[PDB]
Design an enzyme around this catalytic site. Structure first.
Site, PDB file in Angstrom:
ATOM      1  N   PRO A   1       0.822  -1.217   0.000  1.00 40.67           N
ATOM      2  CA  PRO A   1       0.000   0.000   0.000  1.00 40.67           C
ATOM      3  C   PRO A   1       0.852   1.260   0.000  1.00 40.67           C
ATOM      4  O   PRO A   1       1.922   1.318   0.607  1.00 40.67           O
ATOM      5  CB  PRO A   1      -0.816  -0.121   1.292  1.00 40.67           C
ATOM      6  N   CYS A   2       0.349   2.283  -0.691  1.00 42.86           N
ATOM      7  CA  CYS A   2       1.079   3.522  -0.926  1.00 42.86           C
ATOM      8  C   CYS A   2       0.339   4.767  -0.458  1.00 42.86           C
ATOM      9  O   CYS A   2       0.656   5.871  -0.917  1.00 42.86           O
ATOM     10  CB  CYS A   2       1.430   3.629  -2.413  1.00 42.86           C
ATOM     11  N   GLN A   3      -0.631   4.628   0.448  1.00 34.70           N
ATOM     12  CA  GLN A   3      -1.297   5.807   0.992  1.00 34.70           C
ATOM     13  C   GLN A   3      -0.439   6.510   2.037  1.00 34.70           C
ATOM     14  O   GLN A   3      -0.480   7.740   2.142  1.00 34.70           O
ATOM     15  CB  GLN A   3      -2.648   5.421   1.588  1.00 34.70           C
TER      16      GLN A   3
END
Ligand SMILES: [Zn+2]
Length: 775
Positions: free
Chosen positions: A442-444
């Site tokens: 995940p890249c949030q």
DNA sequence: ACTTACGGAAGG
DNA sequence: CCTTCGTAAGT
């Protein structure tokens, strides 16, 4: 939701994150062995104050700034000069702290470099303990390895109590100019043969970068590549004789030139080749991507304006394989497949790209959300898909192998893993069967738009990387790939990034890193992503793919230590083989629709015209997912009042009050854009229309008219872009399928990887695989 | 389930 | 000193 991790990664990431449990006279010795090229005798050992200095050891010099520590040199050979003076050749050993690792490097780890020296033997300060570490590769050795490491660690601690000289070791070679750590060439070092490979390669490199002319004026050499008459070469556009959001209109490609003759140092004469978009954009809209035009123009150029070679053929002898993206320089005018495990598969863009390259087949995949798992199942019928959180999957996998004492996890993971039925447990992979592990965490958390990144929810999303690493530690595959956002390497002063590399370096891998831009790979969207390649010691690290489309973006460099920077690929702003892709080349063929359409199945009404359209449609005859989400009356009126002109945005909204059909009067201006227009550059792009000659913005999970990205209106229609249009922008083929409602499909699109990028990476991996020498 | 209101740091 | 590229609070 604390991540489930192995012992190695947990120990490495200590004091950080959570879910961590602390449970005078110099003489020659011996006889001579030979003579060098010039004839001086060369020896092997030497006695210096009662200490032996043999080939393959470490010598410590003396340097200025006495607070600093002395340098360390690995001895190659020793010999006596004609002037009866003692000599030695040494290779510099870089310390871990002075590398890109920073604070995460170990004390006793040194790295070989390509810089050598030869100073007088008397001036050395002393000798130091040194050894080379080489271990067998494979999962079955893992347990043994850890035990050995434990022993080593204990011994070191004792020395730091008794203040004996430290013991050093080296396992890899550090290349900042290549930005990575590579395997040691154990056969070319310690030879004591009067021949140094580092010096030879440095001399060969220094010989280059100088213009040399061949005999009979056949051709010349530049930067290591030969140019000859009757060939085709590139010339920069500016060498040969205003933006809102899609800042790429005023850009040109490489000029194709044919050498005629060399004339007086020397100068070249070149016949020019023209291109369709040098005539007009309309003509280029319906023309092939690699077509040129024949002209009689000849121009005289200096010999320094060359950047490569290419080929020009006729319309009867072509490669006959229409791969996309194009990776070969040709124009015209008139048995190794790997078992792969996918983590965070999503819809499956990366898996689709890597499978299309013929290098990988996906046997197991892990996904979190149900619609993404359904889409992956629909797109890959023969794969096994697990719709569960990765932590419980890892716990179950380790339970199957009887390794429940080698993992750190919470009770929730054990509870969820105990509920798996026997059918799912018998189809899980086991160590030794997996050769490739891939996925994108995940890249949030690392994103720049997230202004709430210091929250509890964001911290647990950044921890998933750890779990990813744990997988690579348990299976020990031959290859490993990691993808994330550009700001992943700079987040938190770049600490975590560094830690990641350190973890891989603890496993015995060879690691390299880079940052690529998807816009230069046949995609009309600006997208910057960071990639990490990891390979086993016996394998070969892949090279980076070469971009072929001109995009206006400066060089993207990663900051090393001591004021150095590394750029994985060159910037293509000043020239490239292929012109960039516009939005009319992407979405200009679909039939017009109205706001809030919901008919899933439609039919194409006009044949494809553009090269991109022909490449992206193929033999498909069923239109799907050409639907958009409806807007309320106020937003519809706002969209109606927006002019259909490039660069239009909310600044064109007239100041008036509108009476809705319900009975409420509303201000036309949202009142939130003028409220905070000073800080955020005036919100350039909000409520903005796309540009026919521009490019798409960065794809997100929710393209709504009032967002940090904006620019989500159709160039000429009063509606939002459809899901199929976003897929076409991201590079998905028309045969791909999606599941769920419109929001779920948009989220699936916004979290994927452009398939052309994955295809290029797979091509590089296949090229590396074919180069693996026999044992 | 849909619409409105918005902080700082890096690299040029 | 411009340019970049998702979460939370009301309806
Ligand atoms: Zn040397």
């Amino acid at each position: 939701m604390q991540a489930t991790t192995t012992r190695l990664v947990n120990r490495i990431w200590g004091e950080f994150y959570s879910n961590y449990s602390p449970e005078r006279e110099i003489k020659w010795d011996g006889e001579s062995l030979g003579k060098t090229s010039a004839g001086e005798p060369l020896y092997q050992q030497a006695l210096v104050g009662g200490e032996m200095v043999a080939v393959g050891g470490a010598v410590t010099l003396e340097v200025d700034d006495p607070d600093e520590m002395p340098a360390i040199y690995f001895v190659e050979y020793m010999f006596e000069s004609t002037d009866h003076c003692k000599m030695l050749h040494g290779r510099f050993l870089q310390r871990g702290s002075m590398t890109v690792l920073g604070n995460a490097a170990n004390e006793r780890e040194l790295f070989l470099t390509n810089e050598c020296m030869t100073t007088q033997l008397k001036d050395i300060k002393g000798v130091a303990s040194f050894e080379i570490r080489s271990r067998p590769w494979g999962h079955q050795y893992r347990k043994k390895n850890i035990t050995a490491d434990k022993l080593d660690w204990a011994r070191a601690l004792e020395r730091k109590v008794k203040d004996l000289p430290t013991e050093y070791y080296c396992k890899s070679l550090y290349s900042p100019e290549r930005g990575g750590f590579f395997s040691l060439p154990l056969s070319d070092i310690g030879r004591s043969s009067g021949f140094c490979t580092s010096c030879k390669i440095r001399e060969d490199e220094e010989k280059r970068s100088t213009i040399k002319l061949n005999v009979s004026k056949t051709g010349f050499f530049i930067n290591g590549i030969e140019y000859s008459v009757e060939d085709f070469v590139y010339v920069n556009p500016d060498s040969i004789g205003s933006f809102k959001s899609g800042r790429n209109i005023g850009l040109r490609a490489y000029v194709v030139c044919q050498l005629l003759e060399i004339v007086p140092s020397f100068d070249v004469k070149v016949r020019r080749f023209y291109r369709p978009e040098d005539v007009s954009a309309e003509k280029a809209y319906a023309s092939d991507i690699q077509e040129l035009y024949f002209s009689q123009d000849t121009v005289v150029l200096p010999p320094g304006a060359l950047e490569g070679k290419c080929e020009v053929r006729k319309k009867s002898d072509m490669p006959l394989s229409r791969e996309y993206p194009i990776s070969d320089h040709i124009f015209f005018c008139d048995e190794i497949r790997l078992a792969t495990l996918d983590i965070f598969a999503g819809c499956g863009g990366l898996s689709h790209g890597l499978k299309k390259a013929g290098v990988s087949d996906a046997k197991w995949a892990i996904e979190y959300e149900e619609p993404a798992g359904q889409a992956f199942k629909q797109n890959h019928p023969e794969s096994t898909v697990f719709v569960d959180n990765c932590n419980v999957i890892l716990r179950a996998i380790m339970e199957k192998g009887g390794d429940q004492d080698d993992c750190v996890s919470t009770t929730e993971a054990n509870e969820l893993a105990a509920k798996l039925t026997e059918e799912q447990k018998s189809t899980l992979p086991l160590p030794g069967q997996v050769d490739f592990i891939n996925g994108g965490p995940p890249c949030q958390g690392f994103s720049g738009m997230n202004r709430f990144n210091q929250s509890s929810w964001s911290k647990v999303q950044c921890e998933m990387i750890l779990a990813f690493l744990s997988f690579a530690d348990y299976f020990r595959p031959r290859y490993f790939l990691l993808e994330n956002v550009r700001t992943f390497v700079s987040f938190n002063k770049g600490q975590t990034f560094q830690l990641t590399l350190a973890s891989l370096l603890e496993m015995g891998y060879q690691v390299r890193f880079g940052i690529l831009e998807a816009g230069a790979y046949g995609v009309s969207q600006s997208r910057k992503r960071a990639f990490i390649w990891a390979a086993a010691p016996e394998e070969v690290l892949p090279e980076w793919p070469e971009p072929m489309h001109v995009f206006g973006v400066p060089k993207l460099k990663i900051s090393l230590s001591q004021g150095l920077h590394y750029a994985a690929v060159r910037s293509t702003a000043l020239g490239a083989p292929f012109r960039p892709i516009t939005v009319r080349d992407t979405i200009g063929d679909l039939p017009s629709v109205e706001n809030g359409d919901s008919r899933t199945n439609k039919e194409y009404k006009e044949v494809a015209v553009s090269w991109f359209q022909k490449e992206i449609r193929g033999n498909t005859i069923a239109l799907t997912d050409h639907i958009c989400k409806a807007m309320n009356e106020l937003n519809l009126i706002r969209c109606k009042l927006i002019p259909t002109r490039p660069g239009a945005d909310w600044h064109d909204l007239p100041k008036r009050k509108v009476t809705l059909s319900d009975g409420r009067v509303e201000e036309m201006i949202p009142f939130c854009l003028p409220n905070t227009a000073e800080r955020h550059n005036g919100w350039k792009g909000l409520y903005g229309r796309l540009d026919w000659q521009g490019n798409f913005p960065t794809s997100v999970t929710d393209p709504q008219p009032m967002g940090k990205v904006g620019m989500c209106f159709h160039p000429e229609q009063h509606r939002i872009l459809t899901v199929r249009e976003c897929a076409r922008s991201q590079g998905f083929p028309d045969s791909y399928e999606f599941a769920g409602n419109i929001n779920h499909k948009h989220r699936q699109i916004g979290n994927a990887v452009p398939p052309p990028l994955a295809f290029a990476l797979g091509r590089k991996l296949k090229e590396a695989l074919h180069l693996k020498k026999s044992p």
